[PDB]
Amino acid sequence: NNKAISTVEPHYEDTAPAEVEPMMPGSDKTPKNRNEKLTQLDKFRFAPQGESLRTNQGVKISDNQNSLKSGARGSTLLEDFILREKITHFDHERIPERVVHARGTGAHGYFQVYESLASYTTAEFLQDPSVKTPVFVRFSTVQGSRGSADTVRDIRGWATKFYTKEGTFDLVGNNTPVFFIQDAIKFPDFVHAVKPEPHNEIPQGQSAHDTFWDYISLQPETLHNVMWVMSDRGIPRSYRMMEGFGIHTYKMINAEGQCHFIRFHWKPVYGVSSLIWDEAQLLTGCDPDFHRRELWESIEAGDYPEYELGLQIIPEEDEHKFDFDILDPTKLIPESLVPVHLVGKMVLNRNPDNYFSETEQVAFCPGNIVPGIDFSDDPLLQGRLYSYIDTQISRLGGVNFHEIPINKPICPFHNHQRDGMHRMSISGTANYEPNSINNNWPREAPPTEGGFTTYPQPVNGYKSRKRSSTFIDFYSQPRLFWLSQTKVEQNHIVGGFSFELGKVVRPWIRERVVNQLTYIDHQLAQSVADNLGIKLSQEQLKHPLPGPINGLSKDRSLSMYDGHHQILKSRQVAILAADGVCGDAIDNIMKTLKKYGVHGKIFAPHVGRITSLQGNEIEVNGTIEGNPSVMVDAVIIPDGEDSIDSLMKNGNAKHYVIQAFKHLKAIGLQGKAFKLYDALPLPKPDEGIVVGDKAADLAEAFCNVMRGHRIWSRESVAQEIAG
Amino acid sequence: NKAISTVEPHYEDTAPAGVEPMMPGSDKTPKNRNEKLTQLDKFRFAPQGESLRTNQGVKISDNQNSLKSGARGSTLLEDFILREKITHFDHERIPERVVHARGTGAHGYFQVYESLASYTTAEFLQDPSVKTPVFVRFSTVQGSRGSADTVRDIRGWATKFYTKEGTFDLVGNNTPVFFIQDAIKFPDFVHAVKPEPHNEIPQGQSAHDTFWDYISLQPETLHNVMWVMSDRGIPRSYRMMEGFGIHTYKMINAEGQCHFIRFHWKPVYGVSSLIWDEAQLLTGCDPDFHRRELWESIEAGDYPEYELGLQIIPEEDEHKFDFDILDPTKLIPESLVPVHLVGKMVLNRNPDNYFSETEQVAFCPGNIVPGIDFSDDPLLQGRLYSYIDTQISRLGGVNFHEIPINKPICPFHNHQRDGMHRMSISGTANYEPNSINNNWPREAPPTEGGFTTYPQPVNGYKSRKRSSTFIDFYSQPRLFWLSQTKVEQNHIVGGFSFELGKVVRPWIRERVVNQLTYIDHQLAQSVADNLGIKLSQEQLKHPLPGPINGLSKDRSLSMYDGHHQILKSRQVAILAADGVCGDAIDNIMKTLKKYGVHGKIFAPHVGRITSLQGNEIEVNGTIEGNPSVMVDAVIIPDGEDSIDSLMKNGNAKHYVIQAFKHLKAIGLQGKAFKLYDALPLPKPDEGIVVGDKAADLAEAFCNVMRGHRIWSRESVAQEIAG
Ligand code: HEM
């Protein structure tokens, strides 16, 4: 009554209750994680504690619940400037999404070099190991719009902004070492092919449709990066557990004018780990924010994303020594031939305060580079230089987007540029160079004092539109990639191809792709052709295959699961429990998990607390229904007679074990919890099943099984299970 | 050579020398024509035999390479072809709509059954011979452009009527009420339901803290929360949901008589919904399910069909109800005021280009025509200023009416000039009154059709204040609750319990169920239990609202009470492998075809399977790529070899378990029961149809399907692991 009426009257009272945790802005949750960039952004942060609600002109608002009307039942008056300003700001909140990589996630951190790279570059942020260079990273997918799901099969973008004392350096990479195309002129064609089709805008976040594969079949240059995205690299488990690549060959110029060709790498301290397809798909349905959320909670937990910056270094005289052109972006440089030197460390240790201000409005370009780094003649990179700044003029509202806080450098940046939309700087001095009325300040900087110069590379040829003959080589590296994959990874590649072409309606497109696969590997083609009902002619089964690359038929560095570099720390475990559960078994599991930095979450039939058979309340993390097995790495079911009975009448709790089994995950069953597995149509316990009566001992064995990531041996029987 | 060819200019042919792919509407249904579509032909491009050119008309010889300083050199700034191709691509994107960003569009027409001159002078409602063109966009609310179709959300429903007396936009939703009463709260409500601003989580979901925090503090939202928590929030198709303009409008007739009006759309294909677990899985394996369903249904001839209905109230009965008809959180119960079906709308042509037509279409509630008018509903009043304001940024300026999909098909002369991308070239005087052009174009007198506002009396004081008569938050939620079948009530409890499960701060969940105790004590207790909340004795005694003009239920607010289930156009999976019974499929298909139902053969691989009779039969797609959640029901024909392979296949055994848990009809012919009996599934209930003869098993199968879902199965479905 009075309580009812009060909700639609001005709210002058406290609303919060009188006084495990939700996600919060980084300033709230990790204020002790600072850097120079974050300190610069503080000038723009708002502390509204104890402030009046106001208009943008600073007028206190007395009634935020009602429009100005002519009678409390009347027509709204045009003179309600508060209503119109509030609605008008609302009406204009949206800006264009990125034309590609629209779906992204940001975090702040810092970078340090291990020791001076002055033997190879003058670049300031690689000279001094004591400097902490602030960074901001945006991870992304490629195909989908804002609001598409995270765990699609797709390439992942990886864009790092280095706020150095001598300029902002943008390393704009992907999570695979090659790209689909060789020349930038094909990029709108390729992108249009993979994007939703123009008549119906179908499908979202997916390459599994006609026009993408039509384009692949007609442009063999794409086959290499298709193999990468068709592998499990196409569905990583976390942005903390994938590799990063600059793809293009850059140049690094040292203080002696010498040039070294270089390729950029990010190696993850937490290993390289991926989902499997069926699990990646179900995750898009039940948590489209899975990667965004995982990254966010990673930082709040102190499991900071941590990556080592690696360089491949090739002397100028060595440019032409490989079977491939090192300026070809569909070619990787196998790490067997040119090792990766780890030269520094990046840590992401603080989430943003405002997604839109920081992550949405950030602007990265390959062209922003700093003295000591320079471009190569890669024709894809050369085209990128012009696109990033062009697109951002309309995405971010004009030529002054570097004045938006997240984009500003931390060093001076005086010049003679003036005006443009939303000009924030205010300049009084002469706006032309050379001038004498200001004694020509600001002034050009000699190269020996840090002024950018281009390396004087020789240029000889004719003005020409032509693909380099040194680029015509489309199958060598797809075949190298294939042969470096373990048996399971090859099977999943076959699954990627077979699932995707399965969604292509036009039959000639599937046959044209399968025909391209016969030039990569005959068994790969045969396996895919079988899943599609295609019969391969005797000719196709004899098609010529490429030979080794500079002596190499394999390179283990291209396999995710051969290197045995799986990391246990920071993984997520479901503890299925209900009322009547053994409280001390849970307590001992949580000690063993925390010992190895693993995160156990109690999932129950309802939120709140459950009561252990010892009568203590145990906090719940979520419900079994809202937290499917696809959201965790392994499942442990502790004991408690009444807990198990309850879990056996819950189809979700039982499906939890069938699903986790089919996704090759480790399952621990303490004591009478084995009844659940038994009830299910599940075969004999394999290596990935850990049964035991004492909790701390079950959990130790359970963690050791987790060290293998997935139980690949199980894959054949797992297919048979109805789940 | 084959390889070299692909990186050189492509002067040769590339074409080779359900069953068919989705295509532009101009290619598949060219015979479905209307006046707006003929106007759009003026802007269609036919590229057969044409050269690839720049935008200035210059022929391009090599679309494969940048201009370089040599074949391995540096790209040249003078390559204008490269820069023009890249620049256009760089600026393809325009802002998404601030709400309803995620949407699907189709063309069609509308006919009035008989003249409505008794009520309105609106030209498109006068003459039943006219086919007045329309364009409809369906949408969700919360999610951005690439979010899933089958989220739990309100669905937007926007119809543009291209009439000869102006373009009229009917911009409504699929539930008869909105969340809030005054437009000034729209940014607050929308911010609360949208992803939260620090992390931009979560997408296409209200299941998070800020949304329920807002609900808990704004009881006026509760009524439409009930609607979204019910199965209304997850419809099966845009063809099977209802539509409402929600606001009370006005219709004025030739005599100057005013009637209050509320708009309705009633689906000829009935009102059907998904269930929550099936909706959520559908967003994983097909985020485009509704967009695809609408497109294919039009290419198949199952044209969406809706009847435009009107609740009509004489201006004198404005105050005859226990609620304010100006309150957009209130519906008018169809018992109290029946809905008159006044005409039909059919959607029968897909667009040619999604971006040109669906993305660029602009609809505003302020786009009315002579014969319709506004009421003093304070939410509608704010909407009049917002639609046009936002379209200036989203669509590039004030000339967005000149974009083809947005143009009227009547004349539209005035004195407006310039603006960004001005298309028309106007030679005459640009002010009124003028003499140098004898004042053309001229004002139209009302008796010749010039718009006038009905002279409604206006009295009071300039004030910011919620009308006393708007302060009724709990009565219509209760009406809606008591009007639901038992299974629909359970599903509402499900929505509340799942959603509040994702809320982190406990006090928000507690404050929300506390609000539920003022709607129905047993709804509050069910939801409180699912969340571990113990209700106090005081809470359990909380006063409940009485009836509304003597009404305690209204059957029309229920989906599954008045048997609104249509069978025509449903989708049936047919699980077949190599070794299936040929004659069975034929007789299944002939039976399904007899009823307007589409059956789709799903096999382990794509292409063809061979029957035990040795013939080949076309597959529609894999079992793996088309889970049970995409079809209305499953049928498994016989064929010992088919059954044997299916039983080795995890997906096909799960197909039936999942079909079962989602309460769908499962047909099993012959030894197909071999497969059912192998799974942990109970004895065949009323929605499990066995039989050895296909036509009979199909006929009985199609008749279980008429009930939409086996609601009885619900209790045993919960315990099935799957
Ligand atoms: C080596 C292959 C390429 C890689 C690894 C790459 C990487 C990326 C990444 C990671 C982003 C997202 C940056 C962010 O988070 O804001 C991006 C955006 C973009 N890229 Fe690429 N890209 C490549 C090729 C191309 C090409 C060939 C073009 C066209 C010439 C292009 C044009 C763009 C544009 C316009 C954007 C959006 C920029 C913005 O709106 O801020 N990229 N690229």
Ligand code: HEM
């Ligand atoms: C009765 C409750 C409301 C309903 C049924 C409603 C319905 C809709 C629908 C269906 C759309 C999508 C139209 C399309 O497909 O393009 C939409 C968009 C929009 N609405 Fe509402 N709305 C309501 C209340 C509001 C309010 C209170 C405001 C703010 C004053 C508002 C502002 C907008 C804006 C700015 C758009 C985007 C328009 C565009 O970008 O073209 N609406 N509304």
